[PDB]
Symmetry: none
Subunit: 282 residues, 6 copies
């Protein structure tokens, strides 16, 4: 099945968003399942090293039936997030919806409809509650590994098109190259090369075609697995930011993560990021 | 028989308010039972780190006879809390009474009647030996899995309802979800989950629905058993309060517990309470 | 037969009064029995490390032939205390006579008459020599285990009662309770329990109803036997006064005892002290 | 192999400086390994006045693959210590590197090197990255059972030495004497004796030859094993400081130690301490 | 071989100056022997109630080889002694030395030569390392039971005789008398008697003829053995000083002693001294 | 064989001058013998309770050979009291002599000669040293139980008779009456009546024939012997002086005596004479 627009070239942005523990100095995740399968979890993060500790509790369930689902998330700041997944009649056509109920912050309900069919993937977006009807449509076609994609943020209230973005990639067994153009001023390219099951390497460049300011922005990210129960991966950028991350498996079920961010060829400077994470799983 | 309302969600209440030793730096318990069947005890606690040495001695008996159950006890606070259980005529009609006899300070007697029926629980309490008597009652109903109930309180002196609460839970084979609301002002949703025979985990969130205050007060506790004669448990609140506890059974009949009270992101201020306890049993 | 009034609650009054070697820093007891049958003894006490040394020698004998019993005393103060015990009148009525001859202080003589019958016990004491006739008596009954008595002191010169106390206890197979009320209030409630041959525990509370809204002094003492040739025991109190004692039988005939009494909690007051005791036998 | 200098009289120091937990009133450490050999460890202490906490976590590994060593630690003060050990350049010469990283305190790095070979061993240290290199070196030789060593520190800023010591030991099967001479006219003469598997005694006396005013101190400590899962220590200093320690092994995998240190014969100065320690091992 | 002059009437001197514990309130001895021949010791006495805890450690060896013997004692109060005993060339000619090295105080070593012949004893002591050397020499003869001898002290600096004493004693099977004269100013007569293996008794009288009032002070001592593992002994002088002592072996290698010192004349003055001693042996 | 003068009417003198422990508040006698036969003893008596303690040491020997004997005594008052006994040639004719060497008090040497032959016992005592030679002669005849006696003191320096005493008694199986007259001014009549082996009674009166002052004084002395290991005996005189004494045998070899004295014509509280006495024996 062809990937969805959000999942095109997921392998490259997956190597610089996940398993990075340099942003939150502390992290505390607990996951647990029950007999019938209702998953529950609690996450505790800390953005500022000398500030409060944010915590959210999530209750998500799925079923191998026609596709009913329900997710209820409740954080410290009380933005209750509810999900609803179902297809029922039409197979492959899921109807998802997300809300954010808050006594202080205005609620925002988003309706997503995804139709899955070979060589064709499209997604709808409907905004409710607040008076701002926007349809963030997107289309994706797959032709012998060539994956195309177009995103358009058409505004009903204004009557015009806000965002117009294009993307084109080519998937293969152990290599995939893609590119994207956002509103014809941001150009992004990637070079993902999978070495083997024990090593991954990727590159991501933002050419940013714009005559007033062109500069250069490149990132090289690696991922090395010494063995099954370990992981170490680091990225490097031209600005000197070199971030390292080390994920270790303690007693089977609990994982520990250490992340750090050094700045090369800039002496030491009075700034540095380092943090740890402790994830449990029943 | 459905559980009494006052004893609803005892599973979650026993994770964060029971078998914790951090409020008293030292404690001494002795539990002796005579051949007659009177169980004598002693509790030598210590509330203040450099103050008085609190100690109490109590006796009680519980026989499978017609139901004469007597309990008494003295303490260092110069008060007595006697207890008297009996059924006699009606089976299941528990008529308990609690006194707070104290020299000088006016005593108060609380007379409780608990009457059980299949799928019905009713408990009432009269506050006698007081110039301003009060009555408090509660009701509990069962729905073959949905255990609900409520409580009301009537002031005899005033002539109206003083405190109205309503609770509704959902028991299952290995998890339980409940929620209680009092005065439309305090709200508490609990959660208890038995992973397996050797691990328990639960959460409790008090939201306090009101416009002036913000955020929420949530808590998360676990309980682990390395084997029969051990118990290690830990709880964490959103404020960073992390309390540990570890009870160990050295000799058969002798238990030793320890406990700390850390503070995430505050290792520079003396707030950390820490204590131990020795309990003996013949 | 009902116990004497002074022997009421002897199992508890004796548990926390004897074998505590903390008051005297030194002790030297020699007991020898001569061939004729008189029992000589020599006690050597010394209160406080620097100061006087008290030496007491006495010789006592009992004859089961006719019931004559004589005791001869001699202290370092050069005073003699005799004790003549005899009945020779009827089975169930014996009299005792005690003198306190001292060259400097006026000698005093006391005549005690004890007359004991099934279910009734009474005795009286007189005060001769010095012009102060005081008659102290008591009367105890026993109704199948419940043992209650009362004592009173009448002054002939004054013409009224100077002290009026009443005690009531409930003995059993292995535990005993009881409450005594002296002249004003000082209502004292005790508790003694003999769990097995290798451990005894006990408590003793004094309500002191004379002063309303005040503290209450309670004590709790144990007694443990590691084997048949040793003893160790301890007592606590609400003021933190903790007393330990250890009696070891070094060789048959010679026993040693080490006792300390440190004030726990606050370890700043110099009130710890320490004492030992040696007892011989021939 | 000849003993290295720090191992000279290592038994004496490991007798009166180890397992004496009377200083810190609390200690909690967890030791655990992973699927591969990493051996995480977490220690947490507490000073006397229940002030801050001193917690750190470290992971050391000794890979037998071409003799690799790595020890990275992390304390709550953002203090990271890195230890690198390797010997793959010459058989019999191993190189160590110790680093310290922390924002506030200046960064430090010492390069250690040890040259070992039969009948000859020497060390060398370079405390660099401080704008003041201090060469700390020493060497020791053994002939037939008598070992002797010497230290020296030469500074390039002053052009001379600032500290030198001369050691002389006579090891044997079960006892070892020893004598050190420090440039401050300090002479420590010590002896260690291992009478049997259940008892070890030792003594150590320091003589200050700089000030000949009877300034001689002498301590001695013992180590007894009542069984194979217990340990009792006792150290007596000349000033009357007596230190006790009792390491009891609970269920195999957890140890608990209780230490106390008072001043004998002077129970008036607040110099006595009591503390405990819990060691968990997975 | 006849006893040396210092060893005449050692039996009486081992009654009133041995195995008494009325001097030091507390003492602690441990004696350890390695499987080489070296014997260590750790003594911890206490001179007065307000003095430092005295401590010394000595090690000595006595080999059945050619005769080399070394004794070295490191003390706390800078009163070290070292002894060197050997015979080597002549069998029986013992050449000992004693040192009193003290930092600050001029040491005074003494060189002792002892020659034993049948019916001839000659001992000479040279006081070297002193500005005013002395020489103390004594001779001892024996006539089939009557043991006599004399001692003279010649001053090298002066050239005269300072100390001139004689002694004459009669040893027998179970008793021994003897009178010694010192400078025709001090005359003493002793008496030692051995009733049987379970009892000893002796007396000592000093007259001091160079006194106008004489005031002869005699002493009478006993020694009783209740069994193999006990030793009770008491002595009494004219002024009523009655000192008791009791040595008991609790475990094999562990001995305990208790000593007291009465006055038996005046009992309102703190003249009484008291003490205990606990010695160990491996 | 007829009794010597000093032994006539000794039975009555034995009931008032022996086993009366009322004069010395404290006594301490130790007697010991040796396998060959020289008896040694040490006595310690205290005349006044607030004074010093006098002590003497005696060494006396006797043999079944021709009759040589030697006694040597030495006390605090420094008197070398010696006794020399010998007969050699003539059997029965002993020649005793007593001296008292004292540096301060003049020596006194007395020579006693006693010739023993049936029906004739005479004694002569000389006087030496001091220049006041006397001769104390006495003669004694026995005729069928009638015992006469005449004592004369002739002064050599004066040439007259100073003391002229005449005694006459009649000994029998279990009764004896005596009468003596000294200087025709001192009349004494003795009446001893032996009841049996378990009781002795005696009386002694002194008429004192003198017209100016005649008065009367009589003494009745009893002695009760309960068994072999006990004795109790008292005397009563007409002067209001009654004294009691008790002798006990505690362990086989050691005796204990207690003496007391009352008063009838005076009574009062602060007049009492009591004292104890210990006497060992090897």
């Amino acid at each position: 099945s062809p990937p969805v627009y959000s999942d095109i070239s997921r392998n490259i942005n997956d190597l610089l968003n996940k398993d990075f523990y340099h942003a939150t100095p502390a992290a505390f995740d607990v996951q647990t399942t029950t007999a019938n399968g209702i998953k529950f979890s609690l996450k505790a993060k800390q953005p500022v090293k000398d500030g409060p500790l944010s915590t959210n509790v999530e209750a998500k369930l799925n079923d191998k039936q026609t596709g009913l689902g329900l997710t209820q998330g409740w954080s410290n700041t009380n933005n209750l997030q509810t999900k609803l997944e179902f297809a029922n009649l039409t197979p492959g056509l899921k109807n998802e919806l997300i809300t954010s109920l808050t006594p202080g912050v205005a609620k925002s309900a988003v309706l997503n409809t995804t139709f899955t069919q070979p060589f064709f993937t499209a997604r709808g977006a409907f905004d409710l509650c607040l008076k701002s009807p926007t349809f963030v449509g997107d289309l994706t076609m797959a032709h012998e590994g060539i994956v195309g994609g177009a995103e358009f943020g058409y505004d009903i209230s204004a009557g015009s098109i806000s965002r117009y973005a294009m993307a084109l990639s080519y998937f293969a067994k152990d290599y995939s190259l893609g590119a994207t153009l956002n509103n014809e001023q941001i150009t992004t390219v990637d070079f993902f090369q999978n070495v083997n099951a024990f090593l991954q390497v990727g590159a991501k460049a933002t050419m940013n075609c714009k005559l007033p300011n062109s500069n250069v922005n490149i990132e090289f990210a690696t991922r090395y697995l010494p063995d099954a129960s370990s992981q170490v991966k680091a990225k490097v950028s031209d600005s000197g930011i070199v971030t390292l991350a080390y994920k270790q498996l303690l007693r089977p079920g609990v994982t520990l993560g250490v992340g750090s961010s050094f700045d090369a060829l800039k002496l030491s400077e009075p700034v540095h990021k380092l943090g740890w994470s402790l994830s449990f799983d029943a």
